[PDB]
Amino acid sequence: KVFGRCELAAAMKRHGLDNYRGYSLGNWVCAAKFESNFNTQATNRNTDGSTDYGILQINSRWWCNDGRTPGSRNLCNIPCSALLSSDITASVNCAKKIVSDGNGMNAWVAWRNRCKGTDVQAWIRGCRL
């Protein structure tokens, strides 16, 4: 499913992400936009053979099992396939563990490069929230 901006902001808010570990809603929406263009079915393979999945492009080396990443750790206890669903619950729950892992949102390269330090509040402007 391809989310609209306000629609995604509203789902992420409901799922407890606004200000989770100090990151305002706008940070999460911005990350999604640049990681996946708001498409839950986005997948991308990395050179190391791991794959990034879903709206938040969570990586198969540490976070989910895809059965093809030798020595993955499966930290979120979930098949990577679950991160592609139209329901973002599994994606959000895993993201909460990643952001809590010690580097905050810097775990998301597109956040660090394209969101961090920008006016992220622009991503939830106009939304009914």
From Swiss-Prot:
Disulfide bonds join C6-C127, C30-C115, C64-C80, C76-C94. SMART domains: LYZ1. It catalyses: Hydrolysis of (1->4)-beta-linkages between N-acetylmuramic acid and N-acetyl-D-glucosamine residues in a peptidoglycan and between N-acetyl-D-glucosamine residues in chitodextrins. Its EC number is 3.2.1.17. Belongs to the glycosyl hydrolase 22 family. Its main location: secreted. The gene is LYZ. It comes from Gallus gallus (Chicken). InterPro entries: Glyco_hydro_22, Glyco_hydro_22_CS, Glyco_hydro_22_lys, Lysozyme-like_dom_sf. Lysozyme C is capable of both hydrolysis and transglycosylation; it also shows a slight esterase activity. It acts rapidly on both peptide-substituted and unsubstituted peptidoglycan, and slowly on chitin oligosaccharides. CDD domains: LYZ_C. Lysozymes have primarily a bacteriolytic function; those in tissues and body fluids are associated with the monocyte-macrophage system and enhance the activity of immunoagents. Has bacteriolytic activity against M.luteus. One of its GO terms (molecular function) is beta-N-acetylglucosaminidase activity. It is found in: Secreted. The lineage of its organism: Eukaryota, Metazoa, Chordata, Craniata, Vertebrata. It comes from the Eukaryota. This is Lysozyme C. Coiled coil: none annotated.
